[PDB]
Amino acid sequence: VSSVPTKLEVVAATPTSLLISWDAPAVTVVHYVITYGETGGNSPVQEFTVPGSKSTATISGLKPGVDYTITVYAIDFYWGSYSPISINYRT
Amino acid sequence: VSSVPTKLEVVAATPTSLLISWDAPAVTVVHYVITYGETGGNSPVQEFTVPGSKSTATISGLKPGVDYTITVYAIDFYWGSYSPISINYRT
Amino acid sequence: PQSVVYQNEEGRWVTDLAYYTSFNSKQNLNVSLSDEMNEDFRSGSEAFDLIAQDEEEFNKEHQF
Amino acid sequence: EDFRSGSEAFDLIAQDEEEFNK
Amino acid sequence: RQWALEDFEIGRPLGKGKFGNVYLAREKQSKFILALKVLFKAQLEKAGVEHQLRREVEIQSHLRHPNILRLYGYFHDATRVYLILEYAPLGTVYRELQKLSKFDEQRTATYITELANALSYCHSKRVIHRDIKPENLLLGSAGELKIANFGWAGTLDYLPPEMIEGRMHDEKVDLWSLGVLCYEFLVGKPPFEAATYAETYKRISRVEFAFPAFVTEGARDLISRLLKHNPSQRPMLREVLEHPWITANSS
Amino acid sequence: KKRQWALEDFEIGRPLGKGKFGNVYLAREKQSKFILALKVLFKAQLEKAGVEHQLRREVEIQSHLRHPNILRLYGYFHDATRVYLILEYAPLGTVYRELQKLSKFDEQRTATYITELANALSYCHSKRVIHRDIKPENLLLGSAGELKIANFLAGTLDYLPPEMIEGRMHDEKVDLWSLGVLCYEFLVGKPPFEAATYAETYKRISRVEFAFPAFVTEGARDLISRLLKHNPSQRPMLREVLEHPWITANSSK
Ligand SMILES: Nc1ncnc2c1ncn2[C@@H]1O[C@H](COP(=O)(O)OP(=O)(O)O)[C@@H](O)[C@H]1O
Ligand SMILES: Nc1ncnc2c1ncn2[C@@H]1O[C@H](COP(=O)(O)OP(=O)(O)O)[C@@H](O)[C@H]1O
Ligand SMILES: [Mg+2]
Secondary structure (H helix, E strand, C coil): CCCCCCCEEEEEEECCEEEEEECCCCCCCCEEEEEEEECCCCCCCEEEEEECCCCEEEEECCCCCCEEEEEEEEEECCCEECCCEEEEEEC | CCECCCCEEECCCECCEEEEEECCCCCCCCEEEEEEEECCCCCCCEEEEEECCCCEEEECCCCCCCCEEEEEEEEECCCEECECEEEEECC | CCCCEEECCCCCEEECCCECCCCCCCCCCCCCCCHHHHHCCECCHHHHHHHHHHHHHHHHHCCC | CCCECCHHHHHHHHHHHHHHHC | CCCCHHHEEEEEEEEECCCCEEEEEEECCCCCEEEEEEEEHHHHHHHCCHHHHHHHHHHHCCCCECCECCEEEEEECCCEEEEEEECCCCCEHHHHHHHHCCCCHHHHHHHHHHHHHHHHHHHHCCECCCCCCHHHEEECCCCCEEECCCCCCCCCCCCCHHHHCCECCCCHHHHHHHHHHHHHHHHCCCCCCCCCHHHHHHHHHCCCCCCCCCCCHHHHHHHHHHCCCCHHHCCCHHHHHCCHHHHHHCC | CCCECCHHHEEEEEEEEECCCCEEEEEEECCCCCEEEEEEEEHHHHHHCCCHHHHHHHHHHHCCCCCCCECCEEEEEECCCEEEEEEECCCCCEHHHHHHHHCCCCHHHHHHHHHHHHHHHHHHHHCCECCCCCCHHHEEECCCCCEEECCCCCCHHHHCCHHHHCCECCCCCHHHHHHHHHHHHHHHCCCCCCCCCHHHHHHHHHCCCCCCCCCCCHHHHHHHHHHCCCCHHHCCCHHHHHCCHHHHHHCCC
16 A cells, blocks of 8 residues: 555665665654565565664675565554555565 | 623613623633622622523613612633623613 | 632532632741842733733744 | 445545545 | 555445544455544644543453444554444434433333443453443444443533542442433433533532432432442442343343 | 632732643732742643643642642632633742753652652542652642642653553552652653553553663662552552651651
8 A cells, every 4th residue: 555654665785785765754753674584485584673763774694696575664653563565676 | 801701781771671781702601690789788689690692681670760780700611700790780 | 818618518618719719827938039030020911911922922833 | 335445445535634624 | 453444445424523534344355344433643643632542442452342342453554543443333322312302211221231231341351431421322233232432511421429539439430420321311411410510510529410200210219329429339230230120121 | 709819819920831731920919929820721722632621620629638748729710711720839840850950869869759759649548539640740849849749652651550551440559650650760860661662661561561770779679669560459558668768768858
């Protein structure tokens, strides 16, 4: 759906590292959770947290040439998580 | 000043009766308490209520020849009478 | 010596704070106010205007 | 009775909110 | 669960309240008939109601009873908050009373026994409602009573002495409210209603009320039992359900 | 007779404060030259925030409470646009402001404050009144630096015991929870339970999950640990607080 954040782009990347970015949502956000894992490859999903002031996030130590799924969740103080956004990326 | 209603006047008169009027107060009044007494004394003040929706009231049964003090009080639901307003009238 | 009073649910005389209640006693204010502060006291017109000032200030800060 | 779905529904709620302002 | 508007189909308005609109709604799978309350974040934040709403949700969420209106979940977006709520075809008891003016003994006693049942459950879980009133009473498919709005003029008509006075209170506050509700049903106005906060407060603290002539010896007795100043002389909910007047007249 | 209060009865001086709902001003009653605080609340905003009912009720409540550690209400009156409260003047401000200047309080100041409050609360309980807001921003300081409880998400939620956040039955023991949160907020500077989000804050309160910074004495830790118990029956009685070895070891009183 129309969700928070709005546009999620991988804006730079290496064989084993990448940088996702998103559009600052105006709605005040406590922090973003970021999940990443090997797409449908039945290894455990991995999760970390970014302060609500931040708009990018950088992941390193990935596997070369693998298709990965990156989910970003924004959290509101009272109401919990917004509807999330996801992206797929190779390498 | 700082009284509700704001200006108060005797609009009409029968020899033994008078009509008082005021300006619709902006604030929401429950009812008004209208009192009147012989300004001399040794006689008790008379009271009656008028719905908050009105801006006028009759006083009847007055004595031909006596000066009267007429006090209006507007009653708020939570807080009580505003500062009252009053006026004199003869016969 | 001036106060309005009424009897309660149990019939006990208790004092209604909606009416003028004379401060019939020497007050135990253990505090000296500076001359400057004692000088800022305003009554009458000059006093209504102080609160008026602060209301129109307040209202447009909350967009009343 | 008449259950709208999709962007029709989206428009519905959004219009209602716009109105809510007044 | 996770949700967005995309998860269900919206009907058209089912009433418009202080912060937004309930709408009729259906889940796209399952095809459940439900109500979807919507509240605009900006008006919520403006009134400072946000904290209160959040707590009320969490409280209601853990109550499951045919007679307590159920909250299925909630979810939110940039601008609004959304409550998946049970649908209640036949509206509020407040509306039904403003229509018929007053209710017959049979209808009332029914409504009471439902309310009493609901509150027996609440009190089982140590929860007290503290705001049982007609605007909070929604009518089900079979004209069943669904109590809503758990969390905290006519802002004091259904309040007992111990709560106007800031004093310790228990479950016996729902019993007071129940007696008030019985009276209003049969008589059409609340028993302590006055023109002013202070005169109302005067009346409650003295439990000063009277009955219209036509009110029956049965109802008088039960209502009188419920409206006692001392909360410990009010009945238990068991005793209300077993009351002669109630057995006799409840569907 | 039956004279009403009016603005004319007062000399108005310098503003002492500016609040959500209006200003407080230093004032002086004309016949008696008593020095008072006059709180003006704007009716507009009271309606907006829907608290007019809460206010009216608390005014009736404060009228029956007389204690040196409770701020005195002397009267109230209104205008087209304002409710006015005539209050005892507290010339040393709020403990919040004092808790910001200092960061945290030492054991002596803290226990002295706790003692004062425990008396105030024991008084209120003797009148069957419970749940007083004893948060630092609602505590004023009188002319000898004594606490005045005034009764007219930061850490707000932390001060509410579990039974209240879950809507359960609650007794006088809620005041014992608040007192523990306050004791901790005094020694530490922040409340014990605040977290990133409502849900996490609530999770901690309900599960009584918290920690003491290392500088906190075992004595203080014993007192707080007992005030912040989930089961209200297990919480100490006010006399047990007043006679706690940590309190008696450290208080002016
Ligand atoms: N489950 C429901 N079934 C039918 N109507 C409902 C239901 N829930 C709420 N409503 C309607 O929503 C409208 C708003 O009422 P409410 O939810 O109490 O909000 P408010 O207190 O802001 O008016 C009313 O017309 C009420 O009947
Ligand atoms: N009785 C009083 N004596 C002295 N200062 C006071 C008194 N009451 C309030 N103040 C001052 O005025 C400020 C604003 O009043 P406050 O009670 O905080 O308003 P609100 O409840 O609207 O936030 C206080 O923080 C304090 O500095
Ligand atoms: Mg928020």
